[PDB]
Design a binder for this molecule. Structure first.
Ligand SMILES: O[C@@H]1CCN(c2ncnc3[nH]ccc23)C1
Length: 167
């Protein structure tokens, strides 16, 4: 039993809700919140910009030190950093950005990072400003993640479409 509330159950392990991931994280304080990161951990917009703003830029400060030490992530890769005031940990995961011409097959690799964590709050990878089809992202999520994932879909209109089209 966990403290996530109001989710629709899609499969044995995937749950979905129309919600703002920032406000959800602040309420639940999950062990792991997933960020929709880029390889440089430049949290400008989308989910990343919103999470960083909620940390008063502490996420960006920590991220800049991470990059200075380690260099960029790989597309499809991830790193674990602090969750600041939002969660114990933040798993920064880089899904392909279609608006940069990145390979969509890497979306499965991106979701595989979730399997290293027993429970996560997460967005649909590569959705929103990353330019992928959210229905496809949800399909890859369900077919790749085996751990317990609580998906927050910000757009209510998008949430309703995701539920009604789910196979
Ligand atoms: O890529 C799409 C576009 C934005 N996005 C989000 N998902 C869940 N919570 C969020 N809060 C702020 C943005 C956001 C997914």
């Amino acid at each position: 039993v966990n403290s996530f509330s109001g989710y629709l159950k899609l499969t044995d392990n995937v749950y979905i809700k129309n919600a703002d991931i920032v406000e959800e994280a602040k309420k639940v304080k999950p062990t792991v919140v997933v960020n929709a990161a880029n390889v440089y951990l430049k949290h400008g917009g989308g989910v990343a910009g919103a999470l960083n703003k909620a940390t008063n830029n502490a996420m960006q400060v920590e991220s800049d030190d991470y990059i200075a030490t380690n260099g960029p992530l790989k597309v499809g890769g991830s790193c674990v950093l602090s969750g600041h005031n939002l969660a114990k940990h933040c798993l920064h995961v880089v899904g392909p950005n279609v608006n940069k011409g990145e390979d969509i097959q890497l979306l499965k690799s991106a979701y595989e990072n979730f399997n290293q964590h027993e429970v996560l709050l997460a967005p649909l990878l590569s959705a929103g400003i990353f330019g992928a089809d959210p229905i496809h992202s949800l399909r890859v999520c369900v077919d790749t993640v085996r751990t317990n994932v609580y998906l927050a879909v910000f757009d209510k209109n998008l949430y309703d479409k995701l539920v009604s089209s789910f196979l």
